[PDB]
Amino acid sequence: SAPSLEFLEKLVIRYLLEDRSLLDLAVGYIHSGVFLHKKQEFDALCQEKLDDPKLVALLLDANLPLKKGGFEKELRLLILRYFERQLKEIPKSSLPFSEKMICLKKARQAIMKLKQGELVAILE
Amino acid sequence: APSLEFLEKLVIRYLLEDRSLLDLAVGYIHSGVFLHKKQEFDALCQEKLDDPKLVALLLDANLPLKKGGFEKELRLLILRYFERQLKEIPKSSLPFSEKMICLKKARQAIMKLKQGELVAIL
């Protein structure tokens, strides 16, 4: 039942399409870089290109079930996924040693908070 | 009251004297936030503790720290960043809709900051 990342990115954007007040919240925590599948859709939604063919198709998709009060749990899972990936990617990266250290600690901390139910921003 | 350059040095000197404060700071700020002390911040993140600018800051005699005073100075540094966005975003090349979103983000950030919250600069 745990969704695919592409499904989760669609879901998150679909909530932002249906209720633009949720975009106001989400831009506190995520940016375009976070998305691995639906970056163009998020970008178009940010520039109110509301007739963009990708965004239209997502707004029209019949298989993305939204629920009252359900947005923040899916935003939190998208962010949690991003930081879980960081935990794998940082040790493989070119970052100076002390920055790998800092960044690993920050990703672990974020994962803790996300699971405590708190939203956490992705800066980098 | 404090110049931006002084606030930046004061923020970095807290981070230099206590690395646990860096752990807190990197939740909210990045080198791009700094206008005057970017090289120093980058040196501290890189643990280049003999960087000559970082050392000048370490040795500065006019940056007394207050116990528990860090978050006040970090919040002011974030507030000033978002106050500048209010001035600079309208003069940018961003398309209108994006200017709107960014400015609303800044106004909302400033409202939280004034209530004592830290807000991330993304």
Swiss-Prot record, chain B:
Subunit structure: Monomer. The C-terminal domain DnaB-binding domain exists as a dimer in solution. Interacts with DnaB via its C-terminal domain (residues 415-559 of DnaG); up to 3 DnaG fragments bind to a DnaB hexamer.
Domain-level remarks: Contains an N-terminal zinc-binding domain, a central core domain that contains the primase activity, and a C-terminal DnaB-binding domain.
Described purpose of this protein according to its UniProt entry: RNA polymerase that catalyzes the synthesis of short RNA molecules used as primers for DNA polymerase during DNA replication. Stimulates the 5'-3' DNA helicase activity of DnaB.
Family in the record: Belongs to the DnaG primase family.
Entry protein name: DNA primase
Residues of the full protein shown: 439 to 559 of 559
